[PDB]
């Protein structure tokens, strides 16, 4: 086929497995299931796909974890497939390796870390309760538009001190960086995102505020003042993490819960299991997959990797590996050792994961106590979409208002 880059001389023929991360063949069975074909019998630990310009894929948690730990061989400098995307990608601190990475990571951790989440608690609680109550007596909703998008996005826009009317523009930009529809390259989307931030960063360096953008723009890295460019590159990433992560994960969880009455009942009768259920859903419905670039020629697990070779290291795949979790496709809220790399692994561990867990846990509690019984709209065929971050196209839900409660 014409979508397959010619196999490089140095890549073994028997290791070819043409997986397409933006449109995987088994997509209709579910996106996690679609990626899981990389872990079927007779598929190697490390394969090469000729799709998307050609790149390596580590298919098992063992290799995914090791590579993320080895930044000297596997650089974050070019972290996105395809190559053109990875080269344009200059977000901070993600496009940097240690030692230079760390000083910027401490600054970002200040604006979205645990202490910030704690002071955001009550507004997060209120917004969820507000959205769910307004939806409740209607007996139906389009969950992606009606909750999964505005709940975490409005929360981030509050944190960042940005107007909610900007959401449609910014959301479109982030989605082109993760699941491009074709209208925009990563380079064009990033430049437009930077174009948005530039005058906001300048004005908030003259009149500082208490919002995340003011804090980054006026911050210091290892004792020296952060530049305008640096702040722009850091803020841009924060918008991506805030607009296209939790949004997608909530839909996966709620799609599951609508199709599994036994599981809803388990959390209704025992609400104190909601944190544990959150982690299991985080495992079973993992959704992010980026990677690294080789700094030099390097033999990795019997395979010869050449300098400049890209390797996808799918965070999603680790927890779905039966070698980390028995019956990985089954959801067990009582699962004893929930193993995953959903928030990443190595020096680039997710800084927003504490914000993410709170948003997930609150949604679960506040939805189940108000709308305990619900399901998918009759006849609805749920479509998923695949990319750097995967998601749900639409999730139509129905319920009987009489079965609901007000808290």
Ligand X SMILES: CC1(C)[C@@H]2CC[C@@]1(C)C(=O)C2
Binding-site residues for heme sit at: 350
Shortest reach from residue 373's CB to ligand HEM, in Å: 26
Beta strands in 70-162 (DSSP E): 74-75, 140-142
Confirm if 89 and 351 have CB atoms less than 8 A apart. Answer: no
Q: By 3-state DSSP, what share of the chain in percent is helix, strand and coil, each rounded to 5?
A: 50, 10, 40
Determine the Cα–Cα distance for residues 330 and 342; give it in Å rounded to an integer. 17
Is 83 designated active site?
Answer: no
Buried b or exposed e, range 55-78, using 16+ CB within 10 angstroms: bbbbbbbebbbbbbeebebbbbbb
Among 94, 144, 248, 310, binds ligand X (CB under 6 A): 94
Among 24, 82, 314, 352, binds ligand HEM (CB under 6 A): 352
Determine the Cα–Cα distance for residues 264 and 282; give it in Å rounded to an integer. 16
Is 241 designated active site?
Answer: no
Regarding 89 and contact with K ion (CB under 5 A), the answer is: yes
- 305 SS3 class: strand
Regarding 387 and contact with ligand HEM (CB under 6 A), the answer is: no
Regarding 388 and contact with ligand X (CB under 6 A), the answer is: yes
- Stretch near ligand X under the rule CB under 6 A, chosen from 54-62, 238-246, 269-277, 324-332: 238-246
Residue of 50, 60, 179, 264 marked catalytic: 179
Confirm if 33 and 74 have CB atoms less than 8 A apart. Answer: no
Indicate the residue among 48 and 91 with the shorter CB distance to ligand X. 91
Is 350 designated active site?
Answer: yes
State the chain's maximal CA–CA distance in angstroms: 66
- In sequence order, what are the residues at sequence separation of 6 or more whose Cβ sits closer than 8 angstroms to the Cβ of residue 205? 217, 218, 228, 231
Residue of 351, 364, 368, 395 marked catalytic: 351
Among 245, 253, 318, 363, binds ligand HEM (CB under 6 A): 245
Regarding 344 and contact with ligand HEM (CB under 6 A), the answer is: yes
Shortest reach from residue 30's CB to ligand HEM, in Å: 17
Among 11, 36, 107, 112, binds ligand HEM (CB under 6 A): 112
Check the CA dihedral 51-55-61-62 and report its sign: positive
Shortest reach from residue 401's CB to ligand HEM, in Å: 30
Determine the Cα–Cα distance for residues 92 and 189; give it in Å rounded to an integer. 16
Please give the size of the binding site for ligand X, defined by CB under 6 A.
Answer: 9
According to DSSP, residue 115 is labeled: H
Give the gyration radius of the chain's Cα atoms. 21
Among 21, 107, 288, 311, binds ligand HEM (CB under 6 A): 288
Is 129 designated active site?
Answer: no
Q: Which of 101, 47, 51, 109 is nearest to 75 (CA)?
A: 101
Regarding 147 and contact with K ion (CB under 5 A), the answer is: no
What string marks each residue from 70 to 109 as x (binds ligand HEM by CB under 6 A) or -? Answer: ------x--x-------------xx----------x--x-
Is 351 designated active site?
Answer: yes
Determine the Cα–Cα distance for residues 1 and 89; give it in Å rounded to an integer. 29
Beta strands in 76-163 (DSSP E): 140-142
Which entry of K ion, ligand X, ligand HEM, none binds 340, CB below 5 to 8 A by partner kind?
A: none
Binding site for ligand HEM (CB under 6 A): 76, 79, 93-94, 105, 108, 112, 237-238, 241-242, 245-246, 249, 288, 290, 315, 342-344, 348, 350-352, 355-356
Residues marked as catalytic: 179, 244-245, 350-352
Binding site for K ion (CB under 5 A): 78, 87, 89
Binding site for ligand X (CB under 6 A): 94, 178, 240-241, 245, 288, 290, 388-389
């Amino acid at each position: 086929n014409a979508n397959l880059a010619p196999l490089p001389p140095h890549v073994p023929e028997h290791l070819v497995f043409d997986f397409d991360m933006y449109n995987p063949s088994n997509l209709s069975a579910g996106v996690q299931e679609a990626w899981a074909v990389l872990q079927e019998s007779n598929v190697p630990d490390l394969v090469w796909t000729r799709c998307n310009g050609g790149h390596w894929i580590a298919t098992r948690g063992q290799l995914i974890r090791e590579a993320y730990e080895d930044y000297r061989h596997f650089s974050s400098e070019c972290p996105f497939i395809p190559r053109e995307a990875g080269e344009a990608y200059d977000f901070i601190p993600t496009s940097m390796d240690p030692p230079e990475q760390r000083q910027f990571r401490a600054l970002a951790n200040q604006v979205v870390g645990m202490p910030v989440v704690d002071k955001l608690e009550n507004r997060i609680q209120e917004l969820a309760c507000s959205l769910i109550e307004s939806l409740r007596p209607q007996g139906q909703c389009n969950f992606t538009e009606d909750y999964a998008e505005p709940f975490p996005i409005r929360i981030f826009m509050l944190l960042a001190g940005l107007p909610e009317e900007d959401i449609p523009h910014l959301k479109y930009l982030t989605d082109q960086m993760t699941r491009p529809d074709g209208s925009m390259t990563f380079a064009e989307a990033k430049e437009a995102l930077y174009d948005y931030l530039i005058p906001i960063i300048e004005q908030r360096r003259q009149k500082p505020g208490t919002d995340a953008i003011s804090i980054v723009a006026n911050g210091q890295v290892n004792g020296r003042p952060i530049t305008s460019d640096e702040a722009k590159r850091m803020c841009g990433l924060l918008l991506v993490g805030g607009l296209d992560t939790v949004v997608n994960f909530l839909s996966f969880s709620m799609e599951f819960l609508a199709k599994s009455p036994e599981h809803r009942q388990e959390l209704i009768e025992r609400p104190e299991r909601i944190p544990a259920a959150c982690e299991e859903l985080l495992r079973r419905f993992s959704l992010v997959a980026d990677g690294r670039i080789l700094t030099s020629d390097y033999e990795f697990h019997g395979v010869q990797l050449k300098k400049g070779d890209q390797i996808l290291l799918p965070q999603m795949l680790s927890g779905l590996d039966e070698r980390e979790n028995a019956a990985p496709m089954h959801v067990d809220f009582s699962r004893q050792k929930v193993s995953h790399t959903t928030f990443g692994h190595g020096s680039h561990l997710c800084l927003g994961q504490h914000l993410a867990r709170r948003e997930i846990i609150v949604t679960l509690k506040e939805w189940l106590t108000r709308i305990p019984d619900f399901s998918i709209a009759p006849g609805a065929q749920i479509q998923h979409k695949s990319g750097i971050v995967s998601g749900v196209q639409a999730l139509p839900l129905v319920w009987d208002p009489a079965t609901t409660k007000a808290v």
